Amino acid sequence: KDIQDLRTALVRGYIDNVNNANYGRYKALVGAYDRRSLLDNRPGGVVEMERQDAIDLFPYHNLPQGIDGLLGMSEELKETRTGVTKLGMGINPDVFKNDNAYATVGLMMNAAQNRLRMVCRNIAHNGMVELMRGIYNLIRENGEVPIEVQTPRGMIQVNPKQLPARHNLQVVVAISPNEKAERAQKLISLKQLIAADAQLAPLFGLEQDRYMTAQIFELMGIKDTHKYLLPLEQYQPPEPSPMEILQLE
Amino acid sequence: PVTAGSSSWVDRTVWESVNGTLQDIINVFCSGDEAVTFVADNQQDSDAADVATKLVNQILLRDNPGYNIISSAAQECLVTRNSFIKYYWDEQTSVTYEQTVKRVKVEYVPSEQIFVDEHATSFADAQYFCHRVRRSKEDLVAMGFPKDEIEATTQSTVAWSRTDWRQDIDADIGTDTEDIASMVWVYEHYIRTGVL
Amino acid sequence: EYVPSEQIFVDEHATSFADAQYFCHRVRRSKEDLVAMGFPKDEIEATTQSTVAWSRTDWRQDIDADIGTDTEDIASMVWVYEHYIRTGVLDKNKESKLYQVIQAGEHILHTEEVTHIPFVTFCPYPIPGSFYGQSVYDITKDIQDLRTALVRGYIDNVNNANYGRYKALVGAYDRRSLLDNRPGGVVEMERQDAIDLFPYHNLPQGIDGLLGMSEELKETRTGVTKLGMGINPDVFKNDNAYATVGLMMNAAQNRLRMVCRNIAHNGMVELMRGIYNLIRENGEVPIEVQTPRGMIQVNPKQLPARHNLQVVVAISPNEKAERAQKLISLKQLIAADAQ
Amino acid sequence: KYSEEVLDELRVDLQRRFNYAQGYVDMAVKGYAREAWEYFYGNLPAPVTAGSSSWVDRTVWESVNGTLQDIINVFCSGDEAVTFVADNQQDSDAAD
């Protein structure tokens, strides 16, 4: 409120001095005035008088060196009590979770940007986290919610009261727009880790492998059961080749 | 604008500050594909976390105008000193076509239709609350006083009427009060007291 | 089709499409629709703000003038009054629903129940608890006035001093010599204090110099810059998409991406949700199945609802590229396994 | 179908609401949108006098389309505009 008041008054004081000075005055009595001739608007005048000390530009008030200059830095005053800048970099959900996410050159760790992380953090833990918890309790005590199961792509009528409470459920806010991306590589990294061992290979059999590739694909390519992957219900084991049979015999 | 010759120019630092903050708030919360992702501490109940995550995302975004709610609750909070959000159980109903459903509606609530006590600090410790809402008579007739529907605070209108200048909430829209779907203000209340 | 902002009439006590109690939409329509619906035996049927606005959306158009054809012509272009009101068409005892109304001059054409308003609005930099937000004009009107008036007060000084005036005393003018248009001296005068530069007013250092930085004021309350850094569809979904050097942390983009994120969530995402809803309760949609190029008349009713469906807007022109790399990356992973 | 007496009451109730609606819209917005277009064209800033050096700056004109360098560049820049996504393979064949 204070910033707007001062900046308004200072600019208002700036304007009228400019408006007075830009469209100028002159000074000369009736003596040597030459009223008829002076009214010519042509910059290339053809007539003057012979006094040579009569007319001069009006002594308009000069623009003060300090009155407007030292309030030109009132901009950073807003930069101190707020967190907005006409040239600074914005914020993102990833750096919201961890400031050192872009520690390469996007250190992100500035008063200009970590101060805006105040309200978003404050509004999240004073706001939405209560919103989900309120909704989660609210949805838990009324109605019957049907949930689509993905095993047959069917529908199951699940009792909402069988749902657990907020005690064993944790909520997070401000997910990244690409949170699909990093999860896909995480599964691939975990997939190659377990594949590197053999003592988990019986445990990580064939039914597990399909839907992992689906989920990795589901983040980008959803409909895999028709062109990309075969459903588990139709993956009949292959009959052994006659070459193997005769080798056995 | 004290005088015509005073060059009544006005600075808009307040407007720039709010927009600068908003350029980041929506860029963080309402920028991702979804809004929230419930996570559990164990797996054998994580079969409920994903279900809840999809349910609220379906409700907040795929069903409700979540983008409007968050944006309105943002631009109208940095100036109003607070903002409020309401969720409620819908009971809308209609060849005997009498389909009835139940929905969890979420709508933004301006900080002007709200009345709170003084010695309270939070929702839980608050002892009294009020919430002025324009409601249709159709909701009222369905459960009370079906035989009389001729039912007929400036500050509560001024602030919203000064959120802009082409709109006024207390003005006469044009629809008659006799209409079954005509709107009328109500007095929502949440108070801890001896009803018994 | 698009809808102008002048052809809409909404009550003051509304804040959004759903809660609106009355609604009108002034539409020009041809009589072909009208004759196929009523009053076939009479077709001689014949608001300045609704004309001035588009008469001043440019200076080369008007909407209330006569195009020329007679009013008897069926293709003659005729105003109608589309209406969407929640009121007691039946007795008020029932909770009043919403009924679409289309009516002509002292005549009514069609009334029907509908559960969703078919219009969608765009609102950048909105205002909560209201139906109409703010505008770039409402922010940039003042800067235009001050900048223009500054140049106007500037230019009037520009031409005055440009028109070089020489004033001397009555004596020693020597009019015959001075008025020569050739600036080459062949005619001259000793006294050296008759002719001198007119004391033209100089340029105010503060009136115009201090206000020359008004450009930054525009770049703060908006996101515009003559050389600034903007936004792209990829960075819209993820700011760190180009986190190499493009941190995006500039006020010119963050206060700019608020409106585009809003105009999505407050705008077209309702349209596709509306588009997905509408296609679900009318007609039979014939779709193409990709196996034999067979042609299947799939019923729209079997389609799911928006409850389990998520919509995304502002796709990238190269999504076909990175999706292909996602598939081949997924392909080599599953190929590496035998299970 | 509906009795004409209902329609006669419908006309009166609809008309009075239309009169109320247009009054608010005209004063609040159409009185400003009318001038906003003219500033967008740089013509309403008054040429008070021929000697007043009637130049007009069009800062609104650069600002109004200023975001629009990005508006069309993000929504309507790609091969298409929108694409639906589902939550399960049961309806994934319908989203496309």
Automatic annotation (TrEMBL), chain A:
This is Portal protein. The lineage of its organism: Viruses, Duplodnaviria, Heunggongvirae, Uroviricota, Caudoviricetes. The chain holds residues 350 to 598 of 747 of the full protein.
UniProtKB/TrEMBL annotation, chain C:
This is Portal protein.
